[PDB]
Amino acid sequence: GITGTWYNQLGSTFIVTAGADGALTGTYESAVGNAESRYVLTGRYDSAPATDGSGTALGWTVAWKNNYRNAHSATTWSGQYVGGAEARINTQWLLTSGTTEANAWKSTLVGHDTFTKVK
Amino acid sequence: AGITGTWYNQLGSTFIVTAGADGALTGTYESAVGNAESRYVLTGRYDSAPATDGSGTALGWTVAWKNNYRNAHSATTWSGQYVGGAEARINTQWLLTSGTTEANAWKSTLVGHDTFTKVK
Amino acid sequence: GITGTWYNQLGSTFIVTAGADGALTGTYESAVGNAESRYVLTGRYDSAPATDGSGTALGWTVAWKNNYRNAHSATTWSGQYVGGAEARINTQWLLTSGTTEANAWKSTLVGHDTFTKVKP
Amino acid sequence: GITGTWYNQLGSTFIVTAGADGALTGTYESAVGNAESRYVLTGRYDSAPATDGSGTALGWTVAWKNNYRNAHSATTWSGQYVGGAEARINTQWLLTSGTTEANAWKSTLVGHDTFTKV
Ligand SMILES: O=C(CCCC[C@@H]1SC[C@@H]2NC(=O)N[C@@H]21)N[C@@H]1CCNC1
Ligand SMILES: O=C(CCCC[C@@H]1SC[C@@H]2NC(=O)N[C@@H]21)N[C@@H]1CCNC1
Ligand SMILES: O=C(CCCC[C@@H]1SC[C@@H]2NC(=O)N[C@@H]21)N[C@@H]1CCNC1
Ligand SMILES: O=C(CCCC[C@@H]1SC[C@@H]2NC(=O)N[C@@H]21)N[C@@H]1CCNC1
């Protein structure tokens, strides 16, 4: 249920393959920020979720460097997949920038993205 | 040459990681705490061309807490930066999401912060 | 704008008064968790926000002790009051529990609550 | 043991009074950011904590407006007090700025501050 194309509330595009081993692989294209075109992502998911109708825990990382831009920063999304007719991946995220020590206190943004199958 | 190696956090967890030339992080994680035993697979990304102005190197990785022995139906992501030099450090904040029922989703996610050094 | 009765996505009820000095005062009733009836809250807001279409920054705290229950924990909500389709307060929150030192790594839950004035 | 002056790892100064009803009142002075002099804070704490060595849960808020300056932002610290010879207040915090709706995705910084008595 995880493999495919997903879209968040900003209009970003998350293209992922869930491997049998628990691997997540794919690309991310952000609608916002210091970003253009696609970025590599990798992550992990629970390949044997609870069979009580609980979500499937997962997470992935993008480092914001590709052949076009380098924003010296990385986002991790941590969340859970919920299947069915309105399938969703509900996440919270941490976006850490490379900073000097003096500016480390303001290195990290936090937010929340909800992914669905329709934009 | 800096990130690759064996790291330990303030809890005594062990983070064995290899930084690829392509920006990949690969390795294993063993937690000293929680619903975990032995090693778990990790993967992540890092900035392979960091600034040269004294800024840290941004990185992140994920562990799903399923291995051959146990499954805690949960995943942690660590987001942070590597700080080079004589006492190299990886300073992170993390999000640990559990798979929940819809009605318990409000309490799905723990947050914390881990600092790693190469000292056992 | 801020003064009034708000409801989040869980059906919790946030009754607040925005004072002229930047004070927030009122009560919170959670629909979920180790909580019953109303709890005291206090907080602060920007009493001279920008006039460029930006939101109004604010935050508040509830300690989960009242006359009925004590959950040995406190939540802070940090967010902004916004206009748009309807009046809304968009937050992220941190819920810290009092823990032993050994359990402090799992002391803090994180989430996000959006409030409107619409009674469910 | 909460009432008094506390200092974090940035060199900021947290002056607080813990009232018998669970109130926190005081002033905060940040060593960093868009901040000058002292700001009002208010918050709440667990006035009947467990007696098993567990910390005392608490939180407070600063809106970054005072008579000198206005940074159109607010920080909330959520954490626990731990007493004893090496007393600490261990926190995580959320700093939200007032933004346009288009910029709301980047409204909020997160971090962690440890306060000590010394
Ligand atoms: O702007 C960047 C990179 C792009 C971040 C895009 C973010 S990821 C979380 C959120 N969900 C999305 O779909 N899009 C946004 N980095 C900055 C450099 C300095 N500070 C940080
Ligand atoms: O306990 C678990 C899995 C193990 C987490 C270990 C955590 S990762 C962040 C922190 N840093 C470490 O080095 N260790 C801890 N998951 C639970 C199931 C129910 N809720 C959640
Ligand atoms: O369950 C509690 C107290 C009640 C928390 C209710 C939370 S506040 C954030 C969210 N938004 C709401 O409107 N309701 C929930 N505390 C536990 C002791 C053990 N761990 C934690
Ligand atoms: O710089 C500001 C206000 C000052 C924040 C200081 C922060 S509070 C958390 C941390 N712990 C401290 O003791 N100091 C720092 N606000 C900005 C306007 C734009 N974005 C954000």
If DSSP codes are grouped into helix, strand and coil, which group holds residue A43? strand
Query: Can you read off the two tokens belonging to residue C16?
Result: 């607040």
D108 contact B CB<8A: no
Beta carbons within 10 angstroms of residue B118's beta carbon: 12
CA angle in degrees (0–180, nearest 5) for C113-C59-C92: 30
Distance CA B81, CA A105 (A): 12
| Radius of gyration from C-alpha coordinates of chain B | 15
Distance CA D72, CA D58 (A): 24
Burial of A117 (0-12, 13-18, 19+ CB in 10 A): middle
Listed residue (D90, A112, D116, D41) closest to C42, CA to CA: D41
Distance CA C87, CA C1 (A): 8
Distance CA D43, CA C74 (A): 10
Beta carbons within 10 angstroms of residue C67's beta carbon: 9
Per-residue HEC secondary structure of D54-73 comes to: CCEEEEEEEEEECCCCEEEE
Burial of C51 (0-12, 13-18, 19+ CB in 10 A): exposed
CA angle in degrees (0–180, nearest 5) for D109-B76-B6: 100
Q: How far is CA B18 from CA A38, B49, B63, C60, D66, in A?
A: 24, 16, 15, 43, 48
Question: Is any atom of ligand 3 closer than 6 Å to the C-beta of C32?
Answer: yes
Domain enclosing residue C92, as ranges: 1-120
Per-residue HEC secondary structure of D90-114 comes to: EEEEEEEECCCHHHHHHCEEEEEEE
Question: Is any atom of ligand 2 closer than 6 Å to the C-beta of B63?
Answer: no
Domain tally, chain D: 1
Query: Can you read off the two tokens belonging to residue C68?
Result: 């009925």
Amino acid type, D87: A
Distance CA C42, CA A9 (A): 31
* Residue reference for tokens 């210091």: A34
Question: Is any atom of ligand 3 closer than 6 Å to the C-beta of C10?
Answer: yes
Question: Is any atom of ligand 3 closer than 6 Å to the C-beta of C61?
Answer: no
Q: What is the DSSP string of D11-57?
A: --EEEEEE-TTSEEEEEEE-SSSS--S-EEEEEEE-SS--SSS--EE
If DSSP codes are grouped into helix, strand and coil, which group holds residue B85? coil
D111 neighbourhood in chain A, CB within 8 Å? 105-108
Pairwise CB contact (< 8 Å): D108 & A109: yes
CATH classification at residue B15:
2.40.128.30
CA angle in degrees (0–180, nearest 5) for B66-A12-A53: 35
- Residues D77 and D88 sit within 8 Å (Cβ to Cβ): no
Breaks (C-N over 2.5 A) in chain D follow: none
B60 neighbourhood in chain A, CB within 8 Å? 61-63, 74-76, 94, 96
Determine phi and psi for B97, rounding to 5 degrees. Answer: -100, 135
Q: What is the DSSP string of B34-82?
A: SS--S-EEEEEEE-SS--SSS--EEEEEEEEEE-SS-EEEEEEEEEEEE
Listed residue (C82, D33, A94, A70) closest to B81, CA to CA: A94
Which sign does the torsion angle of CA B31, B34, B38, B41 carry?
negative
Question: Is any atom of ligand 2 closer than 6 Å to the C-beta of B65?
Answer: yes
Distance CA D103, CA B37 (A): 42
Query: Can you read off the two tokens belonging to residue A98?
Result: 């490379």
CA of D33 to the centre of ligand 3 (A): 31
Which residue of D94, D105, D107 is the best one to mutate when testing the A interface, meaning the one whose CB has the most A CBs within 10 A?
D105
Pairwise CB contact (< 8 Å): C59 & D63: yes
C57 contact D CB<8A: yes
Element containing residue C26 per DSSP (H, E): strand C23-29
Which residues of C line the annotated binding site?
28, 39, 77, 93, 105
CA of C108 to the centre of ligand 2 (A): 12
Q: Could you tell me how many residues make up chain C?
A: 120
* Residue reference for tokens 């979720």: A49
Beta carbons within 10 angstroms of residue D51's beta carbon: 6
Element containing residue B84 per DSSP (H, E): none
A106 contact D CB<8A: yes
- Distance, CA of B93 to chain centre: 9
Distance CA B94, CA A61 (A): 12
Listed residue (D110, A113, D75) closest to B94, CA to CA: D110
Q: Which residues pair with D17 in a beta bridge?
A: D25
Percent helix, strand and coil across chain B, each to the nearest 5: 5, 55, 40
Distance CA B5, CA B1 (A): 9
- Residues D66 and C72 sit within 8 Å (Cβ to Cβ): no
Q: How far is the alpha carbon of D68 from chain B, nearest alpha carbon, in Å?
A: 31
Distance CA D82, CA D49 (A): 11
HSE (side-chain half, CA atoms, 13 Å) at B63: 26
Amino acid type, A94: L
Q: How far is CA B1 from CA B31, C57, C63, in A?
A: 24, 43, 47
Distance CA B50, CA B88 (A): 15
CA angle in degrees (0–180, nearest 5) for D45-D112-D86: 65
Which residues of D line the annotated binding site for biotin?
28, 39, 77, 93, 105
Element containing residue C47 per DSSP (H, E): none
Distance CA B82, CA B60 (A): 10
CA angle in degrees (0–180, nearest 5) for B41-B43-B49: 150
Query: Can you read off the two tokens belonging to residue A15?
Result: 């293209």
Query: Can you read off the two tokens belonging to residue D69?
Result: 């300056």
Distance CA C78, CA D96 (A): 6
Distance CA A40, CA A28 (A): 7
Distance CA D9, CA A80 (A): 34
CA of B34 to the centre of ligand 2 (A): 5
* Residue reference for tokens 């900035």: B47
Q: What is the DSSP string of C52-100?
A: SS--EEEEEEEEEE-SS-EEEEEEEEEEEEE-SSS-EEEEEEEEEEP--
Question: Is any atom of ligand 3 closer than 6 Å to the C-beta of C35?
Answer: yes
Q: Which residue CA neighbors atom 2 of ligand 1 most closely? A: A34
Query: Can you read off the two tokens belonging to residue C86?
Result: 């309807």
Distance CA B96, CA A57 (A): 9
Distance CA A92, CA A95 (A): 10
CA of D58 to the centre of ligand 3 (A): 13
Please state how this structure was obtained: X-ray
A31 contact D CB<8A: no
D58 neighbourhood in chain C, CB within 8 Å? 61, 63, 74, 96
Distance CA A88, CA A55 (A): 10
- Distance, CA of D57 to chain centre: 12
Query: Who's near A107: CB < 8 A, 6+ residues apart?
Result: A96, A97, A98, A99, B56, B81, D111
